[PDB]
């Protein structure tokens, strides 16, 4: 029924799509990005979302118990999902402070961003319409930089605590624990507004830019490839690990949607219809941003990679910029940050609920029902919102660039996969695993499936973490700003957090296992109840 | 995907025991889930059980499930069928059939062996 | 256990003439989860129809299909003498698998 497709729709549909893959793509110029995304859509995205759903439903466990029934040595695959969820909630949900932040400013005569009259703006300011007549600043790139994110000069330099963005953060917070708590927010008929919405707006912010003058040079900019940046490591892990991010794979949250479907039901055309909606809203909503990229270059006269800033807020420089263009731009500029909440809120409630139902499935001696479980969820949201708060500093900038690199992106998510696949494919077996989709869904994987998991996932995988290490460059924020190297040392520390769980993990369960060791390992490779 | 041919049907005495056989060729025995299907003397027919591919899935009709034991040999390209407990109403033609797809059916179908019980 | 019942068991039919059959079941059937199997007089069935309307690999192009839910049947466009045999359908939802009573053509 569809409180499935809802639940995954409203899940991995989301700021991944609308904000991520935007910034991500114009990092790496354009074109050549698409090529790796691509071929990692097609290799592994689709296949491993399959094999998560199929692991969630098969075992009707959630996130980390369900390797207990397939293979319990490599439990520790679901400790390190579950961890990654934990990073990624903790910075995920800042965004949506930001667009908090950008809604309650909306409620003005004129918009801030529109001119620079302002008191924050630079002496170095040039509304962009006059720019064509030094090193002159666009209004809608400062407010950004000095109202919205007030950006310290490092992050050595953490400087004061935003006040009202970290209200923003907290109204955020109490809206999350509201809808788990009492489960509101989903299953009613006001989902067909919540779900339908957001495309709307996409719509309505695609048809202006594809109108504006110079879009055509955003979009040549958008699919023609240089093949030269190929070269670089770095399109390679942005691309495919903006795939299992995309996805939200590696996170477990998947499998914990899936354990709560029926056993029997065929999820295979409902998975691959799902995933057409994602990748087809990702590509889609490229055209939007970047023919306002083009607009841009051909309103200031320069090159297209020097508009906006190549990194998180390149959504929050070129949207604000298209709803400038429009009529009452007041409204549309509600209506835009409004379906950024939405949408970026049910990606969060579903990325919450999964981590807690995975949580609770460890030990539902406690944390059984709302005696307990909201008292759970409360402190869950507590932790996070002061972990969250980090960033909400004059400094978060870096620090928030930091964790969306490190923290739930990169080589954590390849590891992850890498392990996901390799078990059911090699330590399972793609003939145990082929028979168990063939009793539940009543047809085996064929070819693809199969050759994706055992072949050409654990492959890309492993091609882009050795190439990432062989090629290395460090990460910058905005192609100027270098971390000092603490920062790095940290944004590695947050990756080993996820990935250390496997190894101590079958540390861990090969002591306090009885017997020689031979029979430890067969033990633990033997399914459990 | 060619051939099934069932053997060893017989007669036996009522409440007595016997074994069927089916070998396959053709095709990739061990790739396929494989069934049992019966026609009653009234040609009607009924669902016995059903094993997988790999043996590890096994479902029996309501009729039989106290009583018949399906098994395979992967290794041999032979399908098997035990009855322990002939009941008079299992006098029939037998069938071993290919249906590994759910939403496809039995492909194929042998050329089936009656079972008596006089 | 499913029930399957198909109403015409018997079908005193000629050359040229439309034939449509039906096949209800106790409870609903999945569209993808129900087939149609052709058993000529004295040889073992052989499947016809699969996933409610698509034709199996021998059936001449004249047979179709339709249905959903709870009710479902399959027609001939004309019938010719090869096609005189006992027609059963079966639902392949969930266990035990049941057959129809099926329907024999006489002509």
């Known amino acids: 029924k569809i409180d499935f497709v809802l639940s995954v729709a409203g899940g991995f549909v989301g700021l991944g799509n609308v904000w991520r893959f935007p910034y991500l793509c114009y990092k790496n110029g354009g074109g050549a990005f698409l090529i790796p995304y691509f071929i990692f859509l097609f290799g592994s995205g689709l296949p491993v979302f399959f094999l998560e759903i199929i692991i969630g439903q098969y075992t009707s466990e959630g996130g980390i118990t369900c390797w207990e029934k397939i293979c319990p040595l490599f439990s520790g695959i679901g400790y390190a999902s579950v961890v990654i969820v934990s990073l990624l909630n903790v910075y995920y949900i800042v965004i949506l402070a930001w667009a908090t932040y950008y809604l309650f400013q909306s409620f003005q005569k004129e918009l801030p961003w529109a001119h620079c009259n302002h008191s924050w703006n630079t002496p170095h300011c040039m509304e962009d319409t006059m720019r064509k007549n030094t090193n002159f600043t666009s209004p809608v790139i400062e407010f950004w930089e000095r109202n919205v994110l007030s950006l310290s000069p490092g992050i050595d330099h953490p400087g004061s605590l935003k006040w009202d963005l970290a209200l923003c953060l907290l109204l955020v917070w109490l809206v999350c624990f509201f809808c788990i708590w009492k489960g509101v927010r989903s299953t009613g008929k006001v989902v067909y507004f919540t779900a339908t919405f957001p495309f709307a707006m996409l719509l309505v912010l695609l048809v202006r830019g594809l109108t504006l003058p110079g879009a055509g040079a955003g979009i040549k900019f958008y699919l023609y490839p240089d093949i030269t940046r190929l070269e670089d490591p770095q399109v390679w892990i942005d691309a495919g690990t903006q795939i299992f991010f995309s996805y939200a794979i590696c996170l477990g949250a998947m499998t914990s949607l899936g354990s709560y479907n029926k056993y029997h039901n065929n999820v295979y055309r409902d998975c691959m219809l799902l995933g057409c909606l994602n990748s087809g809203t990702s590509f889609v909503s490229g055209f939007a941003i970047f023919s306002i990229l083009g607009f841009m270059a051909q309103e200031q006269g320069v090159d297209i990679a020097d508009v906006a800033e190549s990194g998180p807020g390149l959504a929050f420089i070129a949207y604000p910029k298209a709803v400038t263009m429009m009529p009452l731009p007041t409204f549309w500029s509600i209506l835009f940050f409004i379906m950024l909440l939405l949408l970026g809120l049910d990606s969060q409630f579903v990325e919450v609920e999964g981590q807690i139902t995975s949580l609770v499935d460890l030990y539902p001696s406690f944390l059984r029902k709302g005696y307990r479980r909201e008292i759970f969820i409360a402190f869950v949201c507590s932790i996070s919102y002061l972990l969250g708060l980090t960033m909400v500093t004059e400094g978060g900038m870096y620090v928030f660039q930091l964790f969306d690199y490190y923290a739930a992106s990169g080589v954590c998510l390849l590891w992850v996969a890498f392990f996901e696949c390799f078990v059911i494919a090699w330590i399972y077996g793609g003939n145990r695993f082929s028979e168990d989709i063939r009793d539940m869904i009543g047809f085996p994987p064929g070819p693809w499936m199969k050759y994706s998991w055992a072949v050409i996932t654990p492959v890309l995988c492993v091609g882009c973490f050795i190439f990432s290490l062989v090629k290395y460059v460090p990460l910058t924020y905005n192609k100027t700003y270098v971390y000092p190297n603490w920062a790095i040392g940290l944004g590695w520390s947050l990756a080993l957090s996820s990935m250390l769980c496997v190894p101590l993990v079958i540390v861990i369960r090969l002591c306090q296992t009885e017997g020689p060791f031979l029979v430890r390992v067969k033990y633990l490779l033997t399914p459990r109840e | 995907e060619v051939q099934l041919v069932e053997s060893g049907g017989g007669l036996v005495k009522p409440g007595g025991s016997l074994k069927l056989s089916c070998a396959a060729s053709?095709?990739?025995?061990?790739?396929?889930?494989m069934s049992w299907v019966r026609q009653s003397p009234e040609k009607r027919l009924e669902w016995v059980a059903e094993?997988?591919?790999?043996?590890?899935?096994?479902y029996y009709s309501d009729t039989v499930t106290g009583r018949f034991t399906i098994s395979r040999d992967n290794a041999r390209n032979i399908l098997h069928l035990e009855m322990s407990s002939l009941r008079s109403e299992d006098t029939a033609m037998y069938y071993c059939?290919?249906?590994?797809?759910?939403?496809?059916?039995?492909?194929?179908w042998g050329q089936g062996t009656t079972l008596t019980v006089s | 256990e499913n029930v399957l019942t198909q109403s015409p068991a018997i079908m005193s039919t000629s050359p040229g003439e439309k034939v449509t059959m039906t096949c209800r079941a106790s409870?609903?059937?999945?569209?993808?989860?129900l087939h149609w199997y052709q058993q000529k007089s004295g040889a073992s069935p052989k499947l016809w129809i699969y996933?409610?309307?698509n034709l199996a690999s021998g059936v001449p192009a004249r047979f179709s299909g339709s249905g959903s839910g709870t009710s479902y049947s399959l027609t001939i466009s004309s019938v010719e003498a090869e096609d005189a045999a006992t027609y059963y359908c079966?639902?392949?939802?969930?266990?035990?698998?049941?057959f129809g009573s099926g329907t024999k053509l006489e002509m």
């Open positions: 059939a290919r249906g590994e797809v759910r939403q496809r059916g039995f492909d194929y």
């Open positions: 053709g095709f990739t025995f061990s790739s396929y889930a």
């Open positions: 094993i997988s591919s790999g043996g590890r899935y096994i």
């Open positions: 409870s609903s059937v999945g569209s993808s989860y």
């Open positions: 996933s409610t309307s």
């Open positions: 079966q639902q392949f939802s969930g266990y035990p698998l049941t």
